[PDB]
């Protein structure tokens, strides 16, 4: 058996690459992860051997740690490799871009001496680039998932635009739910305080997943955050707080000035 | 039944069909069978009433 | 007319959306920028009408800011949308990262009340990520162009993933030639050690852009750099010099502790 | 250029690339690439092989 994992872009049928769509062309089963049921009946016409990891979320009210939720899946995926069928992994977006289900199968199939491999696809990053007319070599770009970075020491630099991934589960520290709560993101207002203003504009940036719709660019102060409607798929872009300082040190080194720059 | 789906996966991936759509976007939905309803979810940007639509 | 610019990504015909090659296929006109000659020729197959932006490149060592180049490679570029053209830019990897003139044919075209548009696409930092099987989401992700981090004080989270795009040509501008890589390289290598160690194993990548081809992983110490032989398509990757700390801080306003983390 | 036409092909097609991984060689011969062609792709010199198309 071997492993490969694709992603299928953000974007209904057009967005994924031709060589990711040959994939799962000619894969003897796919295990899928996609945004809705119009996606999920476009891969079914690609190709009929289908699972579903979204069966592996809970369901029926039962309470489930996230963690077990993606091992699940994970065993799903190897089962078949190790069975000895041409598996393709099909996820939304990038299939390693945020993303541990693709990583874990792929480590733990090759250390079971297993092919696997990862395609690039399109992640939500580079379709927010493409939305908001935003070139990330302008000014630079980080991102961290909005969790990590009030559990763990993050500092962020507030001259480059702030990427805050998964920011409507930010500071849901049980992994269960798929929303946080208001004080939650109270406490991430204050925290991010220390680098940016109350009234500082950022943007709840949501791209669309169906060509008929329109991406969610959704401007507030940061202030505003905690009342503002956040869905699984947002993410929260920061723009920059302060302006750019010369490396005085470096540019005498390099011997350039600020005359030549900008 | 309907042909919500086939409809947005053929706009999704036909650059031609594309620019006809955002040319005139109620006519090229007509022109693909799409009910009244449908087209007002579409216009209106309800995309919760346009998954229930197409029979989830 | 018209414009849409479109990203063919860095492998060979295989990498680039379904959409944006039907976004080719039907256009009147397409300017393209791409990595060899194996692409180009794939590109002519795909449409005949094809004018080659790399021809506006400085050549026989002639004077021409790079800022003259991208001006006349859009002045190019619009000229065909203004004579009513259904135009199509062509740019390898995703076209609105590290690519000015998209940008500014998109900013010139809006401005004089045409259509334009940027579809995304898979770039360098997309095939690094599943290239060397690293998820920007483990410890967080900075990219910056390493001019950028010489000239202007950009402190970065050495926990996180930390790209250098365009290594190459890091700290060079017009006057003052240190085309010494070697001397460059070393006040980057100096200004990075205020975080790093001098034997902190740092990365060349460069992905491959030929289907047979092998992708340049090197793997050196930081202090090494300074001789190693870098080229325009490299990117320099700094992984963590540091684990994730708790941020007892933050956990302390959540009401928790490490132990309660999901 | 049948070594144009041999990588366009590999680089979209799942299938091929799958046959190609299994055999490289088995797979470059019967799609007529020459021994230097070849030689050219397992030594990995790319430069080589921008001179045996012109480009
Ligand atoms: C588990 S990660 C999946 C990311 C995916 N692999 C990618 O390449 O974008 C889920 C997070 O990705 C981001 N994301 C997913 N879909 C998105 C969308 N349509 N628009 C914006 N961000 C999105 C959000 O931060 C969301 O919480
Ligand atoms: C002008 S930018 C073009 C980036 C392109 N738009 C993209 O989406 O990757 C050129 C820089 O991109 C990066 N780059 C381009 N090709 C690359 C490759 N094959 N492998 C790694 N990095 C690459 C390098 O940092 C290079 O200096
Ligand atoms: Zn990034």
């Known amino acids: ?262 | 039944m309907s042909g919500l789906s086939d409809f947005f996966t053929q706009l999704g991936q036909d650059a031609q069909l594309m620019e006809d759509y955002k040319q005139n976007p109620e006519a090229v939905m007509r022109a693909h069978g799409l009910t009244d309803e449908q087209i007002n979810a579409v216009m209106t940007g309800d995309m919760e009433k346009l998954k229930t639509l197409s029979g989830d």
Chains 1, 3 share one sequence.
């Open chain 1, 1 to 262: 058996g071997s492993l490969v994992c694709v992603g299928t872009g953000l974007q209904l049928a057009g967005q994924i690459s031709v060589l990711s769509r040959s994939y799962i062309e000619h894969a003897d089963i796919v295990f899928s992860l996609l945004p809705d049921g119009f996606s999920q009946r476009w891969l079914t016409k690609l190709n009929p051997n289908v699972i579903n990891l979204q069966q592996f979320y809970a369901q029926n009210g039962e309470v489930k740690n996230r963690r077990d939720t993606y091992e699940q899946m994970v065993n799903a995926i190897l089962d078949a490799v190790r069975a000895g069928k041409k598996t393709v992994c099909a996820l939304y977006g990038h299939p390693g871009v945020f993303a541990c289900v693709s990583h874990m199968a792929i480590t733990r199939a090759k250390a079971e001496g297993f092919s696997a491999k990862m395609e690039p696809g399109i992640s939500a990053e580079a379709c927010l680039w493409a939305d908001l007319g935003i070139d990330p070599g302008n000014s630079g770009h980080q991102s961290f998932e909005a969790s990590q970075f009030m559990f763990f020491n993050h500092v962020p630099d507030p001259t480059t635009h702030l990427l805050l991934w998964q920011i409507a589960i930010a500071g849901e520290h049980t992994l269960t739910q798929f929303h946080t709560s208001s004080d939650r993101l109270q406490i991430l207002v204050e925290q991010l305080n220390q680098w940016y203003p109350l009234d500082h504009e950022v943007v709840i940036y949501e791209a669309a997943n169906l060509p008929i719709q329109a991406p969610r660019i959704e401007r507030l102060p940061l202030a505003n955050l905690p009342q503002a409607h956040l869905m699984p798929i947002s993410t929260l872009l920061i723009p920059p707080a302060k302006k750019l300082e010369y490396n005085y040190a470096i540019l005498a080194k390099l011997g350039i000035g600020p005359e030549d720059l900008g």
